[PDB]
Every structure is written in structure tokens, then in C-alpha cells.
Homo-oligomer: A and B are copies of this chain.
Amino acid sequence: HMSFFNKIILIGRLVRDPEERYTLTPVTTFTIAVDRTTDFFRIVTFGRLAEFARTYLTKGRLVLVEGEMRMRRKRVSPEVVANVVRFMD
């Protein structure tokens, strides 16, 4: 329950290699190019998905990303907290 919903699904290329970035643990970020001019999206992954991201994802590679569109303030910064990342190619 809640009464709200936030879902984003993107398919794009990785335009550069993922950054592994362990918190407190594992966080991997990468930005994908989702062309329509292009839209660029910062993707964030956590835990095993962060782990999967860093040890398998590389630039150019085409991925599906499923997650939430975070509008994080305070100066509003848009990131996708991914719950799913699959290779497409």
C-alpha cells in the first residue's frame, strides 16, 4: 500500500565505464545514453546489482534499466535507482 508509484524503464548504451564506490555496501554508478537528440541518465545500483554492474558492465554496452526516478535535492539531481539491469546485446 501507499497510493503513489514511480517506475522508470530505459534501454540505452553505457557511455562510460561504471564507478564502483563502496558505502558503509557496494554502489556502482553509470550513465546511459538513451537517444530519442539524446537523454543522459545517471544510473545507481546497490548490493549484488552494484557488484554485477561493476564486474560485468562496460562502455558502449546496451542495457535495460528498470528502477525509480529519484529527484534528489538541495539542488535537484536526477538519478535512476535501478532494481534491474540486463544486457540487451
Chain A contacts to B: CB under 8 angstroms: 2-12, 34-36, 39-41, 62, 64, 68-72, 76, 78
Least distance between A59 CB and chain B CB atoms (Å): 16
| Copies of this protein, total | 2
Least distance between A78 CB and chain B CB atoms (Å): 4
Residues of B contacting A11 in the complex (Cβ-Cβ under 8 angstroms): 3-6
> A6 near B36 (CB under 8 angstroms)?
yes
> B5 near A8 (CB under 8 angstroms)?
no
> A71 near B40 (CB under 8 angstroms)?
yes
By beta carbon, the residue of chain B nearest A81 is B36
By beta carbon, the residue of chain B nearest A40 is B71
By beta carbon, the residue of chain B nearest A2 is B35
